[PDB]
Amino acid sequence: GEVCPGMDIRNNLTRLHELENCSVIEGHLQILLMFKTRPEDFRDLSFPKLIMITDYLLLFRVYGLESLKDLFPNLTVIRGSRLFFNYALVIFEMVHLKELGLYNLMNITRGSVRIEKNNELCYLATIDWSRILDSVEDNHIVLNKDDECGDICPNCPATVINGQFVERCWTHSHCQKVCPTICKSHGCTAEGLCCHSECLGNCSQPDDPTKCVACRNFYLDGRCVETCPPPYYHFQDWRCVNFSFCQDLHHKHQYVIHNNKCIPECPSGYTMNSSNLLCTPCLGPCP
């Protein structure tokens, strides 16, 4: 599917369908202050093509939304390139949310989770966040129904972490996926076979970098690669783009080339050589 840009959806769900063909959201996704919505508005609303968000996902005051299992069933990675304070996932004052249900979420590459003040929210104690975030120390998961819920799981890969039992499930009908330790963050197939080391979270076939659901490093021409090879540039810290792409952006921020990256603007101490979008340093003061 498409790569869509960061979005900020308020008041109406009309603009939410702009996401219908996205595989990747290159930016953040904020859905907020939806006071007109009811559960019926979300019974037939799904974005099954969405696999990854490069920055953060934020949900605040969205009426009638009871679970995210139908909205984002296949969301596998939130990269956290840019964060909301220090958070890659924010669920705040979500009036009717009964469960997260992000049963395909395998990795949050950078940043923490803040799930606060969700009066109906359950299925939180059942999630092993250590499988998703390296550091759960900065998680702030407080003031939810689950602070007594009666969370009931399908069968799940239950575990004891410290002295705490954690059943590892997202909903009454969805377990949390777990891979052998040898797979690290790469993911595995249903049979436990490791995805390629260039994959992140999941793959359709083992040990094949063209069969990844998402990439650990960079994406190029249906393949996960360690770094962008020439003549390509690193873009948004997840994909390889060509000069012409960076140039088209500039002529539509006015994007520049710097250290094999296509970026919004020249850093301090540099000026942009006009004929080739290239940041050049300033000998003496910058013009």
Binding site: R10, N11, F60, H140
Partner: peptide
């Protein structure tokens, strides 16, 4: 923090 809380409070001083 209270800073996160305060960000939201302050946003609700927008027009809809």
């Amino acid at each position: 923090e209270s800073s996160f809380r305060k960000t939201f409070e302050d946003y609700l001083h927008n027009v809809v």
